[PDB]
Ligand binder design. Structure first.
Ligand SMILES: C/C1=C\[C@H](C)C[C@H](C)OC(=O)C[C@H](c2ccc(O)cc2)NC(=O)[C@@H](Cc2c(Br)[nH]c3ccccc23)N(C)C(=O)[C@H](C)NC(=O)[C@@H](C)C1
Ligand SMILES: Nc1ncnc2c1ncn2[C@@H]1O[C@H](COP(=O)(O)OP(=O)(O)O)[C@@H](O)[C@H]1O
Ligand SMILES: [Mg+2]
Lengths: 139, 371, 751
C-alpha cells in the first residue's frame, strides 16, 4: 500500500473509531476490511485476527497500525456464476428459497441483512435476476 | 433302505429286518434228499427239501446239516438255505437290502471268504459285514462289560469284554453242544432199552431233550434219590403214540457239559473254562466280570443251569466277592436281537463292506474290516 | 475420504447400545476427536484396525424402507425404527419384502375400516407399510395367478402375532365381501383360548409363550368369497409335559385344572394342590403373577362351548388330563437291577385305574413288564426301574399328544365348511430363535426349525432379486447368494447331532455325557460351525444363522427318549368306562420313534406345505420388557432384531445393490452437481456421464433400464459431496452480501 492508500484507509479506519482513541475493535476489523473493498470469509477474518477470544474481540481495541498487517494478509466471475447456478432453469430464484438457504446454510446471516440487500431486486413472482443482482452487489 | 440281519448256526436259522424286536423267520436248518424210489406217477418229485418242509416230511427223507460245529461243511447246501431264506421266507431280494452275517469266534478264514464271495457274487448283495456272536449278545443285553457264554448246536465259546474292548487272547472254544448232547442222550437211552438210529429219529431225541431234561443242582444227591424212588421219573409220547419212560438218565444228559468225561472229551467242564477265561484276563477287570456274566444261545436254556453255575463258580472263585449270573428269558434269541441293534446304529453305516471295496481287493478284504 | 470434521458417527455405549457422535477434526491414519450430544468432549481409539459406523444423512432417515438407507448397519436400523416409532407413531416398517412390526400396547385407530378400502387396490409401493398392505398383496397374488399364498409371522409371542393375524383375517373378510356369509374370524378368535390353554407355557424368560406352530388356511371360493377355515398344527413340544427346568411350568391346562379342582364339577377327579403332582411340581413355580387361573379356566370352558364341544366331551378331556397327573405320581421300588414292582394297593395307581376303568391288576402288571413275540413263541420280560420310569413318561406324552390332535380335529370340524376349497391363503404363527443363558433340547429343536424357515426365506428372496435383475436386463450372475445348508447338514444329516442322539438312545449304557464324546470325535475340527466351549466337556456351540448358541448335554437323553410298550396302550384302548379314551387312539412303528425324529418328521410336513406356496412375511418385535406403551429400549430391540434375523437379513442385503434410483428421481436431486455442458438432451446418458465423472470406480454402480443401483454407501457419498459443494457456494454468496452491508455502513460514515 502506498501513502495515498494508507491515508485514505486510515481516514476510513478513523470513521469506524466509535471511542476516539484512534482504534477499532477486533470485531470491527472485518467491517473495515469489507469497507475497504475486501470480501473475506469469517474464517479468513479470524485467521488474520489470530483467532481472538470473545472478550478481546468485543472489547480489545487496535489502531490502524495493528490492523494494517492484517489488511495486507487478507489482500494476499465464473465460479461466482456456477455458485448462482447452484440455486437455479429460467434464470430466476425464489425469494423464499434464497432467504432460507442464506439464513440456514453456510455462515448463516440474519433475516434483516438479507431483506436489506434484497429490497427492490425481486419481481412480482418473487424472482431475482441473479446475474444483475450479482453485478449490483459486486460494484 | 433297511438291512437284513441273519444268523447261521447249526440248528436254527433266525432272519429278519434290522429294527424289528424279534426275528421274522425262524426255522430249523436242514437239507433233505429222498432215499426211496418214487413209485407214484405225477407225485411232483422235488430235488430237495429245505428247512421246515424237510422237518415235516422227515420220515421220508434223510436229513443232513450243512453246518457242523461252526464250520460250513458244504456250500451248495447253504446256497440253498440262503436262497430259501431270502426269496420265500423274507420275500425280499438280496440285491435290495444290505445284510449282516454271524459267525463263531474262531473259524477257518476260508469259510468267511467263501461266505462273502457267495454274498457278493451269487446274490449280488449290496454290502455286508460279519460280527462275532458274543459281541451281539452284549448289545442285546444292555452292557458294555461282561463275560459272555454262548452255546448252540456246534460251538460253545466264551469271550470276555470290558467297556467295549475284546481280549482276544482269552477267547475259549469248546465243542460241547446241543448236538453232542443229543448224541450222548441217544447212547444213554440205549442203556434204558430204547433206541433211535436213523437221522429223523435223532430229532425225536432232540425234542425229548428240549422237553424233559434239567440240571441237577447237586449231582450225587439226586442220583442217589433217583435210585431211591421213581419220584423223578416221567414219560413222553412218540409220534406214533407209543410211550417211553425215562429215568435218573433225565438229568444226566445236560450234566455232561459240566463233566465232559461223560462224553470222553478232555477239556474241563464249562465252570473251569469260564473261570480260566476270567483268570487269563487282567486282574482289575476280574471284579467287573464276576459281577456281569451273561448267557446266550439255546444250550443254556436248561432249567437250573443258572443256579448251578452260581453255586459252582461261587465255590471255584475266591470267596467274599460278589458273583452274579444274568440269564434273560430272551437268551435263545439274544444273538439276533443284538444283531438288530448293531445293524440299526448310525455309526455302523460307515463300517459295511461296500461292493466296490470287494471288487478292488477280492475276498481278502473281509479280514481287514471285520475282525 | 468419507470422514471429515462435521461428519457423524455412532459409538458403542452401555447406557444404551449405540450413541450419536460428531467428528471435530479430519481423521488421518489412531485417535479420533469427537463430540457427544453431552459433554461434547471425547477421544476414541481405532484399537487395532476398526472404524466407527458412519451415520446416514437425515434425508434418508425416517423414510419407510430400511433398504433405502445408504449405509446399512445395526445402529442405523435401530435408530430409524426408533424415530419412526417415537416421532411419527408409525409401527409398521419394511425391509425389502419383509414387513417388520413393533407392537404398541396402546390401541390404535389405523386398522379402521376406511383404511382397508384405501389399501384395497394399491400395490405395496404406493403406500406406507401396514399389515393390510401384505394382506392385499397376498389377495392380489392369489387373484393374478392361481397359486396359493401364505403369510408367515414370527417373534416372541408377547409381540402380538395374534393381533396381526386377526387383522389379516379382518381385511380378507372385508375386501372379500363375505361379512354376511362368514363367521370365520368370530370362530377363529373363539378358538384361541383353547389353543392358548393347551399349547402355552411359562418359559424362564416369558409368560404365555406358545410352544407349537399354528397354521390356519382361509379357504376361498372360485369367486374369492370366504368359504371357511381349516386349522393344522406342527412342532408340538412334547418333552415339556414330563420335564421342566426351574421356574418353568408345563402346559397351562394342568394349572387351570388344579385351580378349579375344589369345584364340585371336578370332585370326581380327586385332584390335589397344584404342586402335589410330579409333572407340575418340578418347575418350582405353580403361580404366574397376575393370572387367576380359575378365571382363565372359565373362559376356556366358554370358548369350548362356543365351538360346540359338548358338556359330555369337556368332562372327558379333563378326566384324561387328571389321569395324566395321577399317572405322574406312580412310583416304583427296585427289587433287583433287572426288575421292579409297584407297592401293594398303591394309591395313585388305584385312582388312575378308576379314572380309566382299567383294572388295577392289569396295568399294575403291564407297567412293569414288556412282551416279546417271536414268530413261534411269546416271552414276557421284566424291565429295570429306570426303564419303567421312561415307559410311563412315554405313555404320558403319547396320551397328551393324541388328545391335542383330537381337540384340533374337533375345532376343525367346527371351522370346516362344505363348499369346494378352490384355493386358499394361509396364515402361520411360529416362534423365532430362542436363546437363554442355558439351552436345552427344546431350544435345539426351535433353532433347527428356524434354520429351515430361514433357508426357505433366503431362497425366496434370492429368487425375487434374480428375477428383478433380468427384468432390468442387467447381468444376474453378479448377484451372490448365501446358503445355510452347511448348518442344516450339521443338524439333520446322517451322523449329525440328531442322529448321534438317536443312536446314543439305544446303545447299551448310553449316557448323557458320553454322547458328547461322539459329537467331539465326529465334528470338533472336521466341521466348520461346531465348537467346543473351552471351560467344559458337557457342552457344545453351534454357529446358527443369527448368532452362536451353546447347548448343554445335561437334559438331552432323558428328554429325547420316547418308547411306548404296545400293550400298555392295548390296556387303555380296550377300556369300556367312557367313550373318549377309545376315541383317541382310533387311528405301529411310530411307537419306537424318538422325540427328535418325530420332530424332524413334523417339520418336513410344514416345509412341504410352505414350499408349495408363495410366502409373504411378517416380523414382530417387543419394544420393552415392561409393557410401557410407546416406549422403546435399544438393548431389548437389538436382541429381538438379532433373534428375528432382521439384522442378518439386512447384512445380506448390504452385500450388493441395496440402493436403487430411477433416472429422473436421481437426476433431479443431483442436477445441482451438473455443469451446463454435461447436461444433455437425454436423461439416461446425462446421468451416466455425471456418475462416471463423479464416481471413478465403475464397480460401485450398475446401469439398467430405469433403475440405477448403488452398492451400499455410494448414495451417502453423493449426498456428502452435494452438501459440500452447495455449502461452499452458499458461504461465498453469504460473505458477499455481508460485505455489501458493510459497504453501506461505510458509505453511511463517508456520507
Ligand atoms: C487229523 C486232523 C485234522 C483234519 C481231519 C485234517 C483236515 C485236512 O483238515 C482240514 O482241512 C479239514 C477241516 C476244514 C474245514 C473247513 C475249512 O474251510 C478248512 C478245513 N477242519 C476240520 O475238519 C476240523 C474242524 C474243526 C473243529 Br471240530 N473245531 C475247529 C476249530 C477251529 C477250526 C476248525 C475246527 N477238525 C474236525 C479237526 O481238525 C480234528 C479235530 N483234528 C484232528 O483230529 C487232528 C488229529 C488233526
Ligand atoms: N428249551 C430248551 N431246552 C433245552 N434245549 C433247547 C431248548 N431250546 C432249544 N434247545 C437246543 O438248543 C440248540 C439250538 O440252540 P440255538 O442257540 O438256537 O442254536 P443257534 O445259536 O445255532 O441258532 C438245539 O440243540 C436245541 O435243541
Ligand atoms: Mg448261535
Amino acid at each position: 500500500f502506498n501513502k495515498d492508500q494508507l491515508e485514505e484507509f486510515k481516514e476510513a479506519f478513523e470513521l469506524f473509531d466509535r471511542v476516539g482513541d484512534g482504534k477499532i475493535l477486533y470485531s470491527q476489523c472485518g467491517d473495515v476490511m469489507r469497507a475497504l473493498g475486501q470480501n473475506p470469509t469469517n474464517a479468513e477474518v479470524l485467521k488474520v485476527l489470530g483467532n481472538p477470544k470473545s472478550d478481546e474481540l468485543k472489547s480489545r481495541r487496535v489502531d490502524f497500525e495493528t490492523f494494517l498487517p492484517m489488511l495486507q494478509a487478507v489482500a494476499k466471475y465464473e465460479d461466482y456464476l456456477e455458485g448462482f447456478r447452484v440455486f437455479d432453469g429460467n434464470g430466476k430464484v425464489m425469494g423464499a428459497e434464497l432467504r432460507h438457504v442464506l439464513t440456514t446454510l453456510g455462515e448463516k446471516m440474519t433475516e434483516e441483512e438479507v431483506e436489506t440487500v434484497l429490497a427492490g431486486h425481486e419481481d412480482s413472482n418473487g424472482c431475482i435476476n441473479y446475474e444483475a443482482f450479482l453485478k449490483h452487489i459486486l460494484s | 433302505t433297511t438291512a437284513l440281519v441273519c444268523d447261521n448256526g447249526s440248528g436254527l436259522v433266525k432272519a429278519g429286518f434290522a429294527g424289528d424286536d424279534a426275528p421274522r423267520a425262524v426255522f430249523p436248518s436242514i437239507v433233505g434228499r429222498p432215499r426211496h424210489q418214487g413209485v407214484m406217477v405225477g407225485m411232483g418229485q422235488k430235488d430237495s427239501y429245505v428247512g421246515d418242509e424237510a422237518q415235516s416230511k422227515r420220515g421220508i427223507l434223510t436229513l443232513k446239516y450243512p453246518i457242523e460245529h461252526g464250520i460250513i461243511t458244504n456250500w451248495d447246501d447253504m446256497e440253498k438255505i440262503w436262497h430259501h431264506t431270502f426269496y420265500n421266507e423274507l420275500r425280499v431280494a438280496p440285491e435290495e437290502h444290505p445284510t449282516l452275517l454271524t459267525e463263531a469266534p474262531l473259524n477257518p478264514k476260508a469259510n468267511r471268504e467263501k461266505m462273502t464271495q457267495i454274498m457278493f457274487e451269487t446274490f449280488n448283495v449290496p454290502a455286508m459285514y460279519v460280527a462275532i456272536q458274543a459281541v451281539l449278545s452284549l448289545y442285546a443285553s444292555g452292557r458294555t462289560t461282561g463275560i459272555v457264554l454262548d452255546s448252540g448246536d456246534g460251538v460253545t465259546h466264551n469271550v470276555p469284554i470290558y467297556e467295549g474292548y475284546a481280549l482276544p487272547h482269552a477267547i475259549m472254544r469248546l465243542d460241547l453242544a446241543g448236538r453232542d448232547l443229543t448224541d450222548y442222550l441217544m447212547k444213554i437211552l440205549t442203556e434204558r432199552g430204547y433206541s433211535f438210529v436213523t437221522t429223523a429219529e435223532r430229532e425225536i431225541v432232540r425234542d425229548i431233550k428240549e422237553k424233559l431234561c434239567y440240571v441237577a443242582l447237586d449231582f450225587e444227591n439226586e442220583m442217589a434219590t433217583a435210585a431211591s424212588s421213581s419220584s423223578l421219573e416221567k414219560s413222553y409220547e412218540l409220534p406214533d403214540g407209543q410211550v417211553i419212560t425215562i429215568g435218573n438218565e433225565r438229568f444226566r444228559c445236560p450234566e455232561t457239559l459240566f463233566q465232559p468225561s461223560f462224553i470222553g472229551m478232555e477239556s474241563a467242564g464249562i465252570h473251569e473254562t469260564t473261570y480260566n477265561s476270567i483268570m487269563k484276563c487282567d486282574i482289575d477287570i476280574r471284579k467287573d466280570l464276576y459281577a456281569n456274566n451273561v448267557m446266550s444261545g439255546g444250550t443254556t436254556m436248561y432249567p437250573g443251569i443258572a443256579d448251578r453255575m452260581q453255586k459252582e463258580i461261587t465255590a471255584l472263585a475266591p470267596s467274599t466277592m460278589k458273583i452274579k449270573i444274568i440269564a434273560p428269558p430272551e437268551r435263545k434269541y439274544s444273538v439276533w436281537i443284538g444283531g438288530s441293534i448293531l445293524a440299526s446304529l448310525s455309526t455302523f453305516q460307515q463300517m459295511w463292506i461296500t461292493k466296490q471295496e470287494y471288487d478292488e481287493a477280492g475276498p481278502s478284504i473281509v479280514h481287514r474290516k471285520c475282525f | 475420504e468419507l470422514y471429515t470434521k462435521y461428519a457423524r458417527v455412532w459409538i458403542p455405549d452401555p447406557e444404551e447400545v449405540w450413541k450419536s457422535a460428531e467428528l471435530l477434526k479430519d481423521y488421518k491414519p489412531k485417535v479420533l476427536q469427537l463430540r457427544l450430544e453431552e459433554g461434547k468432549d471425547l477421544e476414541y481409539c481405532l484399537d487395532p484396525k476398526e472404524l466407527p459406523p458412519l451415520r446416514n444423512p437425515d434425508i434418508l432417515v425416517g423414510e419407510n424402507d430400511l433398504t433405502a438407507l445408504s449405509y446399512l448397519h445395526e445402529p442405523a436400523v435401530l435408530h430409524n425404527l426408533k424415530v419412526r416409532f417415537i416421532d411419527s407413531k408409525l409401527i409398521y416398517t419394511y425391509c425389502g419384502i419383509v414387513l417388520v412390526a413393533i407392537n404398541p400396547y396402546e390401541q390404535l385407530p389405523i386398522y379402521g375400516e376406511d383404511i382397508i378400502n384405501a389399501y384395497s387396490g394399491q400395490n405395496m409401493g404406493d403406500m406406507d407399510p401396514h399389515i393390510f398392505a401384505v394382506a392385499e398383496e397376498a389377495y392380489k397374488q392369489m387373484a393374478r395367478d392361481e397359486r396359493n399364498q401364505s403369510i408367515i409371522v414370527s417373534g416372541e409371542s408377547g409381540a402380538g402375532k395374534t393381533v396381526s393375524a386377526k387383522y389379516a383375517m379382518r381385511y380378507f373378510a372385508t375386501v372379500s365381501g363375505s361379512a354376511s356369509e362368514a363367521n370365520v374370524e368370530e370362530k377363529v378368535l373363539a378358538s384361541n383360548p383353547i389353543m392358548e390353554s393347551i399349547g402355552n407355557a411359562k418359559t424362564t424368560r416369558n409368560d404365555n409363550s406358545s410352544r407349537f406352530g399354528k397354521y390356519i388356511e382361509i379357504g376361498f371360493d372360485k369367486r374369492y368369497r370366504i368359504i371357511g377355515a381349516n386349522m393344522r398344527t406342527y412342532l408340538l413340544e412334547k418333552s415339556r409335559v414330563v420335564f421342566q427346568a426351574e421356574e418353568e411350568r408345563n402346559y397351562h391346562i394342568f394349572y387351570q385344572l388344579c385351580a378349579s379342582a375344589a369345584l364340585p364339577e371336578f370332585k370326581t377327579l380327586r385332584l390335589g394342590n397344584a404342586n402335589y403332582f410330579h409333572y407340575t411340581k418340578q418347575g418350582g413355580s405353580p403361580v404366574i403373577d397376575g393370572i387367576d387361573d380359575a378365571k382363565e379356566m372359565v373362559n376356556t370352558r366358554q370358548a369350548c362351548t362356543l365351538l360346540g364341544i359338548s358338556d359330555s366331551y369337556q368332562m372327558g378331556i379333563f378326566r384324561i388330563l387328571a389321569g395324566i397327573l395321577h399317572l405322574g405320581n406312580v412310583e416304583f421300588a427296585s427289587r433287583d437291577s433287572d426288575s421292579c414292582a409297584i407297592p401293594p394297593k398303591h394309591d395313585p395307581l388305584t385312582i388312575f385305574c378308576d379314572l380309566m376303568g382299567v383294572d388295577y391288576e392289569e396295568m399294575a402288571h403291564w407297567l412293569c413288564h414288556r412282551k416279546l413275540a417271536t414268530a413261534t413263541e411269546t416271552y414276557i420280560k421284566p424291565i429295570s426301574k429306570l426303564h419303567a420310569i421312561n415307559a410311563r413318561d412315554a405313555l404320558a406324552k403319547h396320551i397328551y399328544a393324541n388328545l391335542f390332535n383330537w381337540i384340533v380335529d374337533h375345532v376343525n370340524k367346527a371351522l370346516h365348511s362344505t363348499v369346494k376349497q378352490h384355493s386358499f391363503i394361509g396364515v402361520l404363527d411360529i416362534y423365532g430363535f430362542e436363546t437363554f443363558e442355558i439351552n436345552s433340547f427344546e431350544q435345539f429343536c426351535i433353532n433347527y426349525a428356524n434354520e429351515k424357515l430361514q433357508q426357505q426365506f433366503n431362497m425366496h428372496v434370492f429368487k425375487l432379486e434374480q428375477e428383478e435383475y433380468m427384468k432390468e436386463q442387467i447381468p444376474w450372475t453378479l448377484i451372490d447368494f448365501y446358503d445355510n445348508q452347511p448348518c442344516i447338514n450339521l443338524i439333520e444329516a446322517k451322523m449329525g447331532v440328531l442322529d448321534l442322539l438317536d443312536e446314543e438312545c439305544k446303545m447299551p449304557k448310553g449316557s448323557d455325557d458320553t454322547w458328547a464324546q461322539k459329537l467331539y470325535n465326529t465334528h470338533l475340527n472336521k466341521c466348520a460351525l461346531f465348537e467346543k466351549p473351552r471351560l467344559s466337556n458337557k457342552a457344545f456351540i453351534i454357529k446358527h444363522f443369527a448368532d452362536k448358541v451353546e447347548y448343554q448335554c445335561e437334559g438331552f437323553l432323558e428328554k429325547n427318549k420316547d418308547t411306548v410298550y404296545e400293550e400298555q396302550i392295548k390296556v387303555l384302548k380296550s377300556s369300556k368306562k367312557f367313550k373318549l379314551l377309545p376315541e383317541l387312539f382310533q387311528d405301529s412303528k411310530e411307537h419306537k420313534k424318538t422325540v427328535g425324529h418325530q420332530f424332524r418328521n413334523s417339520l418336513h410336513l410344514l416345509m412341504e406345505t410352505l414350499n408349495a406356496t408363495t410366502p409373504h412375511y411378517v416380523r414382530c418385535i417387543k419394544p420393552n420388557d415392561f409393557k410401557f406403551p410407546f416406549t422403546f429400549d435399544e438393548k431389548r430391540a437389538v436382541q429381538q432384531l438379532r433373534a428375528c434375523g432382521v439384522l442378518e437379513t439386512i447384512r445380506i442385503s448390504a452385500a450388493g445393490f441395496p440402493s436403487r434410483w430411477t433416472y429422473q428421481e436421481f437426476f433431479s436431486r443431483y442436477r445441482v452437481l451438473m455443469k451446463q455442458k454435461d447436461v444433455l438432451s437425454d436423461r439416461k446418458q446425462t446421468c451416466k456421464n455425471v456418475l462416471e465423472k463423479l464416481i471413478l470406480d465403475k464397480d460401485k454402480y450398475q446401469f439398467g433400464k430405469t433403475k440405477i443401483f448403488f452398492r451400499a454407501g455410494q448414495v451417502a457419498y453423493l449426498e456428502k459431496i452435494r452438501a459440500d459443494k452447495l455449502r461452499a457456494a452458499c458461504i461465498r454468496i453469504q460473505k458477499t452480501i455481508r460485505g455489501w452491508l458493510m459497504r453501506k455502513k461505510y458509505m453511511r460514515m463517508r456520507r
